[PDB]
């Protein structure tokens, strides 16, 4: 009598890409948040719009904000950087042509 729903759209999980919020334990579609799919692994911690507004998170004092990782400086790559290193791996660690 009604499958489980998620996100601000309150539609079911039909297989598309989603993030889990860290304030509440809900899940949100990338397309509903207007976040490009290629930024799939560039999110460190996500907080839905209703948790950043203090409506459904867990604080009470400050409000949680979505933190983004540092993307590999190769314009093609959309993988997160390593520690200190400005590249996602050694296979991309070349800064200059010579």
């Amino acid at each position: 009598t009604g499958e489980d729903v998620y996100c601000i759209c309150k539609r079911p999980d039909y297989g598309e890409l989603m993030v889990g919020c860290d304030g509440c334990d809900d899940w949100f579609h990338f397309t509903c948040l207007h976040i490009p799919e290629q930024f799939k692994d560039l999110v460190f911690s996500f907080y839905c719009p209703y948790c950043q507004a203090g409506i459904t998170g867990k604080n009470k004092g400050s409000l949680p904000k979505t933190l983004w990782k540092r993307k590999c400086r190769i314009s093609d790559c959309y993988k997160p950087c390593l520690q200190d290193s400005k590249y996602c791996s050694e296979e991309h660690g070349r800064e200059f042509v010579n």
Binding site: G15, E16, L17, W27, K40, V43, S45, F46
Partner: peptide
């Protein structure tokens, strides 16, 4: 973060 794609 925590992501999920069943496809």
């Amino acid at each position: 973060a925590r992501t999920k794609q069943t496809a």
